[PDB]
Amino acid sequence: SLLEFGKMILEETGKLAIPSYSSYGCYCGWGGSGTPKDATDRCCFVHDCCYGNLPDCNPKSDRYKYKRVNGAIVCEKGTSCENRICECDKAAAICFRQNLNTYSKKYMLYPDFLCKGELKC
Numbered sequence: 078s079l080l081e082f083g084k085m086i087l088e089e090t091g092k093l094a095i096p097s098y099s100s101y102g103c104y105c106g107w108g109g110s111g112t113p114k115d116a117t118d119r120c121c122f123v124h125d126c127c128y129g130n131l132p133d134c135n136p137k138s139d140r141y142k143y144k145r146v147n148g149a150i151v152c153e154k155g156t157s158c159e160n161r162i163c164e165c166d167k168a169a170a171i172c173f174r175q176n177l178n179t180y181s182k183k184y185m186l187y188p189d190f191l192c193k194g195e196l197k198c
């Protein structure tokens with residue numbers, strides 16, 4: 078759920094999910110169109126696509142458990158949905174940490190009219 082995802086983000090990047098990753102670019106948060114603006118936005122695109130592969134799961138509200146084996150994120154056994162949601166979130170958190178160096182505040186609160194086109198998952 079968003080509760081675990083937000084915590085994973087904070088632990089990984091030192092940034093709070095809201096508002097650093099909730100209105101960034103075209104895909105981070107409310108958002109599903111246009112060309113991703115930068116690496117971080119591409120992380121969100123992939124994350125959206127990952128959730129899209131789970132039509133009969135509820136990733137926003139279904140809670141999963143994860144532990145940290147030293148630095149590594151390890152998803153603990155749960156239902157099939159919880160397992161797959163956790164893997165989507167883990168990937169996004171790592172993607173965010175890998176691209177922190179290019180995170181740009183100019184993409185915060187990005188207006189919707191600047192998100193143009195389509196990218197197919």
Ligand SMILES: CC(=O)Oc1ccccc1C(=O)O
Pocket residue numbers: 079080082083094095098099106
């Ligand atoms: C669901 C929502 O509106 O906000 C979020 C978007 C991305 C990551 C975390 C959150 C959140 O609310 O915690």
Ligand SMILES: [Ca+2]
Pocket residue numbers: 103104105106107108109121125
């Ligand atoms: Ca989105």
